[PDB]
Design a protein around this ligand. Structure first.
Ligand SMILES: CC/C(=C(\c1ccc(O)cc1)c1ccc(OCCN(C)C)cc1)c1ccccc1
Ligand SMILES: CC/C(=C(\c1ccc(O)cc1)c1ccc(OCCN(C)C)cc1)c1ccccc1
Lengths: 213, 214
């Protein structure tokens, strides 16, 4: 219903805050991130409810979308924070880790490097905040009819941002392609992430349902 | 390679297309799929070498891109040929499985329904052959690009090719970048399905280097 520019403003206003973290072992480092993550998830839900077209979906669909996309969203949020910190990841203002410390957790050295590669790619493209919030909304809606019309609106919005940037048509859809292809790499990183979290001993749906309702 | 046109890009990719192989005739499942995939893999190497700008890369990079994308390439091919067979996957012309047949297969418990939905998606989008071969080429160059400027230059060109096909088809410019977005978002799902497959298979850098010595 809305215009390409008020879509930007609405999403920007719905942006979650940057939370603070609470040598490392494997269990203490994953304790830090899990905590930050679970705190971060509360704010993600409130953000999702303010993404245009989300609350119009059934509760069953809202939960399902967040359930499959939550790690993707945390990761692209992490990458966005670490953009101006080459060779490092900004989990929190009080938790900036280089590649060296990432070996505290086994199997995390691979995922770590994939996040750093994404961060450099965003810097190479000089990703804007107006585009970032658009990419993040797409992730929430795509990873899981009405949804596609909303997704089609975000595409127009992204194009609108690139057209106002002074870009000709060729560089516009080229950049659009470049951006969306990164999401495939983000999905990949999430998949490898779920594995590791599954490779651990023992409520998201409960948290999702509790806060969404 | 960077100086081709959209029509020359399409023409090169279409003639680079691998043949649809058959499952081994033996009247008297993962074994059949493994056998089929390994024979398909040999044709994939020949195809990849015909993808514009792929041979401009080093031998090491060619191996890396293929080891990262091979299952995605096989899966999108599976989805493509299963398009006009609703609610059923066409692994081979003589190996056609529907859902209940597929539910009883090793670890295809998750991806079968995903592959069908992807096939449903392409069908209701009316995916053209010219678009398909473009998407498959994109997969080849993009899957391992993060795990280099020439690669992104070829990708941008395949993007230019896709847009041209949509403009010629008679789509408005708004419909053009919308369709392009839809197609590329699907690649995320295909990446997702591949990961699910790789894991199950996990329970190479070798053989590729062997095949590409040709
Ligand atoms: C890349 C770091 C990521 C963590 C992360 C945390 C916060 C953030 O903003 C971005 C990334 C991470 C760690 C743990 C985690 O668990 C939460 C779910 N619990 C309840 C099982 C989620 C993310 C991670 C994910 C899986 C394995 C290893 C690390
Ligand atoms: C979706 C079916 C796919 C098979 C397949 C996909 C497309 C195609 O054109 C042909 C087959 C499949 C099965 C086995 C396989 O292994 C080959 C490599 N070996 C040497 C380990 C690859 C794909 C598969 C992958 C992992 C687990 C279960 C199934």
């Amino acid at each position: 219903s809305l215009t390409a520019d008020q879509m930007v403003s609405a999403l920007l206003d719905a942006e979650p805050p940057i939370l603070y973290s609470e040598p490392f072992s494997e269990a203490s480092m994953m304790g830090l991130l899990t905590n930050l993550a679970d705190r971060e998830l509360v704010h993600m839900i409130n953000w999702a409810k303010r993404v245009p077209g989300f609350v119009d979906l059934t509760l069953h669909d809202q939960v399902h979308l967040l359930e499959s996309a939550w790690l993707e969203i945390l990761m692209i949020g992490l990458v966005w924070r670490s953009m101006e910190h080459p060779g490092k990841l900004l989990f929190a203002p009080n938790l900036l880790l280089d590649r060296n410390q990432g070996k505290s957790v086994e199997g995390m050295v691979e995922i770590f490097d994939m996040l750093l590669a994404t961060s450099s790619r965003f810097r190479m493209m000089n990703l804007q905040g107006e585009e970032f919030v658009c990419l993040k909304s797409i992730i929430l809606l795509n990873s899981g009819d009405h949804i596609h019309r909303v997704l089609d609106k975000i595409t127009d919005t992204l194009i609108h941002l690139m057209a106002k940037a002074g870009l000709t048509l060729q560089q516009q859809h080229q950049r659009l392609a470049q951006l969306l292809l990164i999401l495939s790499h983000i999905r990949h990183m999430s998949n490898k992430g779920m594995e590791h979290l599954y490779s651990m001993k023992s409520p998201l749906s409960d948290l999702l349902l509790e806060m969404l309702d």
